[PDB]
Amino acid sequence: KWTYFGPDGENSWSKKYPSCGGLLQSPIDLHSDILQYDASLTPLEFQGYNLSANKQFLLTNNGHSVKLNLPSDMHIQGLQSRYSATQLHLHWGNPNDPHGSEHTVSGQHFAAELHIVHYNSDLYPDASTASNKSEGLAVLAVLIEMGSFNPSYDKIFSHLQHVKYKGQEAFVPGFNIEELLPERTAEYYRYRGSLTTPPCNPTVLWTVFRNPVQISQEQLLALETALYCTHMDDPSPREMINNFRQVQKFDERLVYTSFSQ
Amino acid sequence: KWTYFGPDGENSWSKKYPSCGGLLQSPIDLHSDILQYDASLTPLEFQGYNLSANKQFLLTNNGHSVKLNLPSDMHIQGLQSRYSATQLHLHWGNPNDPHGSEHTVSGQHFAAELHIVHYNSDLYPDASTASNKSEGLAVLAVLIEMGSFNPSYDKIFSHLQHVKYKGQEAFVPGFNIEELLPERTAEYYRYRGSLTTPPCNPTVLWTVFRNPVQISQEQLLALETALYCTHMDDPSPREMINNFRQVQKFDERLVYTSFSQ
Ligand SMILES: NS(=O)(=O)c1c(F)c(F)c(S(=O)(=O)CCO)c(F)c1F
Ligand SMILES: NS(=O)(=O)c1c(F)c(F)c(S(=O)(=O)CCO)c(F)c1F
Ligand SMILES: [Zn+2]
Numbered sequence: 245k246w247t248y249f250g251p252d253g254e255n256s257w258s259k260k261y262p263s264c265g266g267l268l269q270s271p272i273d274l275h276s277d278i279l280q281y282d283a284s285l286t287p288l289e290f291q292g293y294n295l296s297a298n299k300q301f302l303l304t305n306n307g308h309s310v311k312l313n314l315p316s317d318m319h320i321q322g323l324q325s326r327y328s329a330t331q332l333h334l335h336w337g338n339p340n341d342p343h344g345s346e347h348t349v350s351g352q353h354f355a356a357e358l359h360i361v362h363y364n365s366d367l368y369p370d371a372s373t374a375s376n377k378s379e380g381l382a383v384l385a386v387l388i389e390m391g392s393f394n395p396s397y398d399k400i401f402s403h404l405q406h407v408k409y410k411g412q413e414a415f416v417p418g419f420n421i422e423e424l425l426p427e428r429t430a431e432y433y434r435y436r437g438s439l440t441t442p443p444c445n446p447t448v449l450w451t452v453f454r455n456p457v458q459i460s461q462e463q464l465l466a467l468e469t470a471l472y473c474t475h476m477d478d479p480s481p482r483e484m485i486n487n488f489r490q491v492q493k494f495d496e497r498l499v500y501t502s503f504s505q
Numbered sequence: 506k507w508t509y510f511g512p513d514g515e516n517s518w519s520k521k522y523p524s525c526g527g528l529l530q531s532p533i534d535l536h537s538d539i540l541q542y543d544a545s546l547t548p549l550e551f552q553g554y555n556l557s558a559n560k561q562f563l564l565t566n567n568g569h570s571v572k573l574n575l576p577s578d579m580h581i582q583g584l585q586s587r588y589s590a591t592q593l594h595l596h597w598g599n600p601n602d603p604h605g606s607e608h609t610v611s612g613q614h615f616a617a618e619l620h621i622v623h624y625n626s627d628l629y630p631d632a633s634t635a636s637n638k639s640e641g642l643a644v645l646a647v648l649i650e651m652g653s654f655n656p657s658y659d660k661i662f663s664h665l666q667h668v669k670y671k672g673q674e675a676f677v678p679g680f681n682i683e684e685l686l687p688e689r690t691a692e693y694y695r696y697r698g699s700l701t702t703p704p705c706n707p708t709v710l711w712t713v714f715r716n717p718v719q720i721s722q723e724q725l726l727a728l729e730t731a732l733y734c735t736h737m738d739d740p741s742p743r744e745m746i747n748n749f750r751q752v753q754k755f756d757e758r759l760v761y762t763s764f765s766q
Pocket of ligand 3: 333334335359440
């Protein structure tokens, strides 16, 4: 299987996953020279993000990240098709180099990055069918930096203790996923790109919010140190750290912004 | 048939060149979390770098960078063996994006990068032999920013038109190679890494000088429009632009600095 380190690391993904060496690869550096204001980029509307407190949602350690399954009535309104949620998950660095976002801004990482994955439910029945198809996916990316304690992110992080090892699963009671989004979600970067993980299909409409969220030093350290990418009984355990892809070349292309200011 | 762009680009190099997916890969981003001062890193001495103006040195297109062959009596003093020079070459961007260094510093690219490749001549008869042996090679890297015209670099750039296509060769009169190095060569970054091109052997002792040199906008444009990766008669010409590898993960590796700060 693929990993972020050693022989099955990202320089080797294209051997079993040819799209990882093809066009439109993500993530990318978002820097001034390639930004272009596009007045067409109006605010997204987040529908069904207030998940029933009476429902429980599956949290899984899948050996690559921690993922929370989301219901298909949750969706984004404002794009060419309805894009329905399927899962969220995170990417981070490590305590010695706590700079593990996937996208960078003017060459700089953030501490971590949250992805809320949606699929084109007008065209496809589910995210696995959509993922390799034209206009299949839309991902929202939130950049995460260290700062004040974030009660909303703790609604996920308080369960990490139950998903410590690969394959493990816990349930999270519904809460308002919109609380994980930053201020002024009207301000965002938008470009066409790819999954940042195998099979790297170039099927993702990216929206990366301009403003980061904050979590505390303790929360960031918790995320960096809670999980393993190996099964519980593995005699050679490995910590799940540095689970981000390096930035990809992006030449003669623009990233559109909904802000000029 | 490896390239820097498209289907045979750097995410695919490991399909033919396994070490490109292995450990110790270069280049890297030099940033504070991975730096450590090392007082044992004393100044290098550059011996036989003042090449006779009455002698000439072969410049060649190899379809990857322009390389200038260097004589083996040119060498570095100060490492744990004598390292004798073999060649120098460059990496650069393109006219519309002059940001093609390989190493970055705190997430920023420089305009271009000069590599002066040396091999351990105490142990090996030639750089090719050395290149697949541990610490077989020592490369000096100079970061190049856009600035003032540089007459010394122009001693190379003025000959580019005789080496416009793959396989072409030209002769460059000797000059003092030390004129290509920056100020305060005593301050450098040192780490164990790899070739930045196929076959990506993890056999380089890297020294990246702290301080950049300048070349002008017109010199960068000349360099970025002078060369092709393809033969003269190729019916599908490809410009030699953007010939730099993305930075590589580097964790549980430190970069040692000969400067505190
Ligand atoms: N990092 S990323 O947001 O690019 C990304 C993933 F990591 C990811 F795992 C999926 S996926 O929803 O698992 C594919 C459908 O089965 C994605 F669809 C996806 F887009
Ligand atoms: N730009 S770089 O300096 O790291 C570099 C290479 F990438 C590189 F491949 C070689 S190489 O030793 O000629 C090829 C070995 O078969 C080099 F010699 C070399 F110096
Ligand atoms: Zn992701």
